[PDB]
Amino acid sequence: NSNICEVCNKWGRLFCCDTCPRSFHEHCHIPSVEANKNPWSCIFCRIKTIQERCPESQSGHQESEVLMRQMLPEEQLKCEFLLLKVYCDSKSCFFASEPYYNREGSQGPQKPMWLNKVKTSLNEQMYTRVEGFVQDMRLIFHNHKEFYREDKFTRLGIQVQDIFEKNFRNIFAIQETS
Ligand SMILES: [Zn+2]
Numbered sequence: 001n002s003n004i005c006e007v008c009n010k011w012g013r014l015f016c017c018d019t020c021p022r023s024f025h026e027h028c029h030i031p032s033v034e035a036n037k038n039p040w041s042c043i044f045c046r047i048k049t050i051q052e053r054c055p056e057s058q059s060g061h062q063e064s065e066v067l068m069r070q071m072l073p074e075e076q077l078k079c080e081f082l083l084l085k086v087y088c089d090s091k092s093c094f095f096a097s098e099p100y101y102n103r104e105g106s107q108g109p110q111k112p113m114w115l116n117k118v119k120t121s122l123n124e125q126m127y128t129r130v131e132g133f134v135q136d137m138r139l140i141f142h143n144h145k146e147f148y149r150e151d152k153f154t155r156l157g158i159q160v161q162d163i164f165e166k167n168f169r170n171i172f173a174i175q176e177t178s
Pocket residue numbers: 005006007008009010024025028
């Protein structure tokens with residue numbers, strides 16, 4: 001196994017997957033690393049196993065169908081994985097914790113959103129449909145763009161949004177279009 005965390009690229013107290021070489025901090029993996037479980041498979045492996053059990057799940061899907069799906073375990077997991085892939089980008093630190101809003105010329109958002117609020121939401125089973133998760137995720141980057149306006153700092157929202165959207169398309173097998 002790795003000598004660093006797969007998410008945050010640092011060494012530390014790591015928990016190693018029993019089916020791939022990946023390693024994780026406790027609260028870096030999503031869900032948080034389960035107490036016992038020997039063997040333990042990480043979320044990368046568990047996502048792989050879905051595909052290897054239903055190879056037609058990689059056939060193209062419409063976004064609109066994906067968003068109405070209930071958050072049964074297999075979709076709960078994909079959201080968890082998608083969230084994790086956003087945390088893997090270092091620029092995610094700008095979106096992790098509760099923001100504040102006090103800039104000349106701008107007003108704060110009506111509904112603030114951040115990645116740890118979304119992680120806690122997934123964790124306490126608050127989302128019933130994929131739709132709900134994807135909306136809060138998109139909200140984070142929408143709120144960022146509206147607040148930083150023309151400051152080049154809005155570029156960070158676009159960059160991390162792109163990481164989210166590419167990974168959404170891959171994980172949920174969206175039909176590839178132009
Ligand atoms: Zn980590």
